[PDB]
């Protein structure tokens, strides 16, 4: 399948010549092949994008309990996120300072201390090394605490940054707070998590996400509740339609922030968009999936709070529940997408919601997107693939993403 096509295609590819490629790039066109297929560009994307920008990791409700921890891989990093004894959430490199071992092997759990499974070096939940067996009298444990990972809490959503010099997160955090706080995400629980691998480059997953040019043919279930190019894109940035604005006004008159806002540098966007017709949620019948709402959004037909933050996440926060999506790179032609359904912590499965009803729409959607992304990746692997033009009407959000990515890479290579 794709693994072999990947190998075949890179055999005859011309040199990456990344500066030349970046120089000649036009914003109205899809990217030249090696951006989507080459290990050279993939290495750059890790080094300069995923290892430098803030990334969505997990909802904070996953760390509700004392000594609770969750682990994730970002590229080659293995990160552990923990609720320390002081109630603070902190992140560390999941690598013992002795000989490097993973410390936490499970995806989630609770501990009293972080105990290396190899020789039992023992760390407090704030990373300090509190016991190391037989290291001699001049061993200085202060030099051998776990390495910290920069971490922020975005109103109930934990973000991390693998750089020692992280970019400004406060601008985004301040902008987003009014929109997110009404969802009370700190009072959520995880109802369901779905993790899939899509056999396409992470950028193809994002280009796919940033348009609904493909949705009428490809997403029967989603199309019952998700609408219009102005919804899914960014042409509302140059000015809002009267019908859309009336929706924003209904939300905001009711005390729910809605207005479309786009970062200066294009990194992130928030907008609370209307749903189709009379739909209220992402369900097959269009009605709320959960009877006990997560948050205080009003009115009931407030629709979907769309939030993207490149490179890691897109999100849908509805009046009754929320969904977060985490995009993580696996190889030049593979990307991991993790979808997390968030419901009120006291919402009871089988009473306030049905698992199938809650998840079926986006399970189906994700599978459809995956098939499309994978088909797109396979064609791109041809040596005959050349950039093609994006639709100005239907793909302005795709251009906006690709521009963000190219600018980010350019700045990092300067």
């Amino acid at each position: 399948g794709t693994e072999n096509l990947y190998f075949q295609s890179m055999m005859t590819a011309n040199p990456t010549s990344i500066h030349q490629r970046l120089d000649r790039r036009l914003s109205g066109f899809s990217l030249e092949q090696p951006f989507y297929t080459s290990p050279e560009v993939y290495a750059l994307d890790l080094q300069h994008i995923f290892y430098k920008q803030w990334l969505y990791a997990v909802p904070v409700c996953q760390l509700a309990k004392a000594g609770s921890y969750t682990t994730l891989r970002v590229g080659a990093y293995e990160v552990v996120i923990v609720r320390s004894r002081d109630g603070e959430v902190r992140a560390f490199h999941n690598s013992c300072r002795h000989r490097g071992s993973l410390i936490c092997k499970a995806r989630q759990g609770q501990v009293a201390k972080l105990v290396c499974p190899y020789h039992q070096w023992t760390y407090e939940l704030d990373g300090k090394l509190i016991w190391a067996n037989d290291m001699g009298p001049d061993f200085d444990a202060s030099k051998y605490g776990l390495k910290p990972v920069n971490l922020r809490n975005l109103d109930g959503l934990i973000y991390i940054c693998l750089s020692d010099t992280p970019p400004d997160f406060q601008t985004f955090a301040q902008l987003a707070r009014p929109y997110l706080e009404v969802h009370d995400l700190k009072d959520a629980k995880v109802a369901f998590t779905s993790t899939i691998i899509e056999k396409g480059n992470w950028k193809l997953v994002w280009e796919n996400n940033r348009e609904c040019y493909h949705c009428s043919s490809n997403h029967p279930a989603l199309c019952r509740s998700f609408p219009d190019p102005e919804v899914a894109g960014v042409q509302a940035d140059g000015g809002v339609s009267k019908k859309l604005q009336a929706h924003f006004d209904r939300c905001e008159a009711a005390g729910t922030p809605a207005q479309f806002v786009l970062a200066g540098d294009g990194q992130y966007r928030l907008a609370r968009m209307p749903l189709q017709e009379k739909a209220l949620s992402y369900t097959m019948d269009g009605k709320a999936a959960v009877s006990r709402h997560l948050g205080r959004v009003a009115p009931p037909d407030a629709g979907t709070l769309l939030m993207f933050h490149y490179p890691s996440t897109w999100n849908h926060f509805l009046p009754d529940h929320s969904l977060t999506f985490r995009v993580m790179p696996i190889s030049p032609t593979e990307t991991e997408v993790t979808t997390t359904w968030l419901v009120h912590k006291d919402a009871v499965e089988g009473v306030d919601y049905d698992l199938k009803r809650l998840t079926e729409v986006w399970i189906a959607t994700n599978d459809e997107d995956r098939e499309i992304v994978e088909t797109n990746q396979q064609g791109i692997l041809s040596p005959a693939y050349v950039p093609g033009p994006y639709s100005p009407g239907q793909e302005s959000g795709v251009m906006q993403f690709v521009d963000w990515y190219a600018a980010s890479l350019e700045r990092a290579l300067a």
Copy 2:
């Protein structure tokens, strides 16, 4: 197995130094290791051989119907071959000009138009882009038709060439026509297709094919019907035995071209050779597999029309049925071989032929060749492998192939 051996062997391999290796090559010896094992030479073989020469794709009878199409991968290219509305067979790159997607996902089918599954850009069966949704009023669809692939019809067998500057095909086509036309291949149907992966370099598959030095020990079934070094090789090029010539004369007196002919540059060869003993076909009992013949070959014991055309194909055309073989590179140590059994279009399975009887000999043979090729590849992966001498008597066809390959590569690197 071989995948790991491949990785191990390339770790310590000396530099490819391809010009030096080509310089010191002697025609009487097998090739130095990296020709058979290195990704560097494999990349060259794709770029300079498979992407530059004409290649056998499929029988034209697979495209008998209106709107019919078949897809194939050549290296990293994905090609679609289609019967257009004017009755002409044409080939295209199976990559949408929008964002690159595969258009035809199935191996075979029928369509009215080529409709991209992603955003439904729609193409006529001659590649023209006839509808693109919402591209703006200055989109010029004339610039965005599917990219054509050079295609020839060799008397019922479709050949393609991935280069914008294809080599001369007419010399071969003219030579071959008299031999092939008597098989009426345009009136065939595909009775059976077998696709296997052999874990050896494509050149090892060809060296294996071009001798019967290995056949008495390794091919019990084939040896009941397939003969003698003069059959399988090229020593008839310097002059024909009296017994072989008498066979050619029996065929040709009956109006069936037979005489051994070898290209100037060694690319191709045709000869109608006698079968063993009293055999008439490649079956366990030696009798015709199919009672309704494909073509008008006479006499009934005309034997096998051998045709090879490097790098893609060898073929056996018998009085009752025909077999085509397509060799396609998968990685430095993997090669795809596709065997196609062709019978008269009106021959009925279970009445005029039995599927098992028709296919069992060459299914077995291919499996035996595969085991041999794979065993050979595994030994070659050793760093202790050094070229060895070919048998002048039994491997003159192997030398002839290796000479063609080296000359072709030399010319392409000049």
Copy 3:
């Protein structure tokens, strides 16, 4: 799992700069990441370590019979070891001198001659080419015998060396003989063989082996019979404890060599160490596994003859049976470990020993070590991994190994 982590980690790794890394290395610290993760260092480890030093292959009792042979892969080499007609054991490259094929496909067997399966070139059991079909009258078979592999017999254990210029083996052989001869290994048979792949670099397998810092937490079964840092390491090299020396004296008064000895260059070590408490063998109850002993070791509580010889082997020779361990590199993050249980040739399964009782302890131990090695490898793959300090008390044997490896590599690159 690890395969993908390997790929991710090498994408962003800094250049290998092997001389600089070797220059700055401190003996008290674990190695910088690329020693354990990079294909560049793995290639060096093959070229300069595994392809240059003597390596443990198999016990000679596996070649007891006339025409008997055994095959093994070392890196990319395929080696065949054979008992020739003169009774001598010899090794060859398992690659036919014609076109390179493997000759012996099975792991073990008996033959009269070595017959290539491809075109039946036939070799005597001392490698001479005695028949080649149809090679012409000026073919000189004297030039086309199998390529020999340097081979030594270490008191019943066959060692090989892939270099044309092997290092001195006699120093080790002379030192080891008194300790090994009392085990009568030439009179052994193989009771059981276990081959596992551990997903860590070969060096991580060795560092793991060379300490029991991890054993109390990780090896419940082994800890019932295997003891103390002085046992498993090398601090007895600077001087022996009174309790350990008393053990050596009990052995040696009984005519069984025991005293700790360490090579000048650190390559190898032999010591006959006491077992825990009252244990006599590696069994769950601590009693002898086999009632008919392999060899003449006395007293019955002589304990374990530990022998390591880098890079290929560690070994435990007990009064009742013996175990050999062979370490072979598979990729930068994979290593093959082969454990061989040796018992007296006349010991009868189900009468003198029970297979489960004999093997269960070290089957369990190996599986525990494997899990630990693999967990360690996964943490090391993080870009945040940095060298950490070894315990002077508990890891002196780890330092000693890493010093041997670094010195060996330095000398080979000079």
